């Protein structure tokens, strides 16, 4: 089982080491456009790893040939702002590192599954997934999961207990909605209160703290995992859609299941009510692909 | 089981959440002097704790009451450098950190165990027991352990399998060495070559990440496992001396035996040649006092 990682920054390295506590990792691949931190980060991960008596081979570097071989890649490379930037201008910024990376992947790994972190999340998939030559089941994204998480988390705290399923799907944003039709769980709550919290958690974190990271770190191992242990789960995907829920020629957000074959949409029955909000997410997702090119 | 964190900086979070993903706690409590940082670490905490699905109270803040009943406490609080700035120099701002935080903890979490992890460690460790009540059996510090690690990393890529027990003990710091006598695993290797990889890892990764993390992440995890499990396991910590192997009134590197009680010194056989190592170790760590007053 070989991991690759391309992008060593915050998320990358800490959704790696995530995933060497809890994986029976062979090998871990770290690519960066700053080698030195690449390196670093794999000789960190590895001193690390001694401590719970594993002794994968762990390399990091700025060339992508490291990636050989990687069962499934996590890309989380990209960039932040200058806070006077602009979410556009990002996006055009970021769609550029995404369609070189995508490249690469094919030229070094043209057979590995690929998990597209690097926000904003849905638009990157989409972009990554046409950038390559890849099939939709080889490329998906870490997102509703982060926010599922999340929202748990309010439910918890709101007395709910036995908490099997609560989802978030749609546009990993402002654009997301709870899929209360499939929540299960003991208690009574009140939806409004909880997934108006969720939509600005993210950012009441990155006020305080810097970053989101171990959220992100931990859905994105669920996620690895889920695919590496072809465990056959059942989780919130960016997933490029190709009809499903009347929905076309873009990524977001909905239950899909993954393992060793990648990520398929499960096709679960939502709401009326909630393939409307699917197909918002869509049209809004769909807008900012055209503001790209795509 | 509830976990205190004294300092929610890069050190501080990252082994709390290492604790997250494999311990079972109830809760963990989250000190920095800075307030919306301790608060935004466990706000991000509780996202990642939901992703495998545990729900703990994990509280943030700048107050020491949060402390109150932490089975043990890990303190990473401190400071960086200026580069222009020196060794003592830090030494005595982190001593003065260090103080002011024993007095704290002992007002707030009287009856918890102490793990010191803010460096010159071995020198904060003994600053720590000094300046509060505290027996020696109740605090002590996080560092060979982690030196050990990489060396079982070192020994794994020189060939070496079936590694149980390789030991590093003495000053967390330059004037460390291995502890040959105790080595046990097949294969030859070459004490020249590994035993000074080691000595500067550190700042190896220092130079190409920015800090080291994830490893000394994981070597307090396996501190503070082994005190709350009460698994009576043998780690090399940096233990308060005050008779054995000849050494007195300083912290030092030794094999140590962990528990619900906390630490005391395993008392192994050392070799002739390896406690006069550790009787300079001890010469070098007790000057260093000296020059703080100590
Ligand atoms: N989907 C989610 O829910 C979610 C949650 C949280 C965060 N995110 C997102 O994930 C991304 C990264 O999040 P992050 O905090 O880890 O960001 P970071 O710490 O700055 O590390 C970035 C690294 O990429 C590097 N790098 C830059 N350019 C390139 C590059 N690598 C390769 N190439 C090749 C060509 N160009 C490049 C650079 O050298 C640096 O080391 C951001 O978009 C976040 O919003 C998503
Ligand atoms: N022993 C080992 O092997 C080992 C390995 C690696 C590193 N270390 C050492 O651990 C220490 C921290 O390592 P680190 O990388 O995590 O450092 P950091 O990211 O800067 O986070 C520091 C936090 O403390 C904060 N803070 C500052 N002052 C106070 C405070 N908190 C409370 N009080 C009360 C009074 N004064 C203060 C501040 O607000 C910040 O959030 C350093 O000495 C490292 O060398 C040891």
Known sequence: MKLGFVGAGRVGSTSAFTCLLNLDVDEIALVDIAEDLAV??????????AGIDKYPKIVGGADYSLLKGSEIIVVTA????????????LAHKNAGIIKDIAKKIVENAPESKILVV?????????????????????????????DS?????????????????????????????????????????????????????????????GATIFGPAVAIYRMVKAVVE??????????????????????????????????????????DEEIEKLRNSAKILRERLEELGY
Do not use: C
């Open 40 to 49: 670093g980060e794999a000789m960190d991960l590895a001193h690390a790893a």
């Open 118 to 146: 690097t926000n904003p999340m849905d638009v990157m998939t989409y972009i990554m997934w046409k950038e390559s030559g890849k099939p939709r089941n080889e490329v998906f994204g870490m997102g509703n999961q982060l």
């Open 78 to 89: 990209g960039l932040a702002r200058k806070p006077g930037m602009t979410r556009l201008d």
């Open 230 to 271: 072809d465990t056959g789960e059942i989780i919130p995907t960016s997933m490029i859609l190709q009809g499903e829920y009347g929905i076309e020629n873009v990524a977001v957000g909905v239950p899909a299941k993954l393992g060793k074959n990648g990520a398929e949409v499960a096709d679960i029955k939502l709401s």
């Open 149 to 209: 998480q999340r929202l748990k988390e309010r439910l918890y705290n709101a007395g709910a207990r036995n908490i099997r399923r609560a989802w978030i799907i749609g546009e990993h944003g402002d654009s997301m909605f709870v899929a209360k039709s499939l929540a299960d769980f003991d208690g009574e709550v009140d939806w409004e209160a909880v997934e108006n919290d969720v939509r600005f958690v993210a950012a009441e974190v990155i006020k305080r703290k």
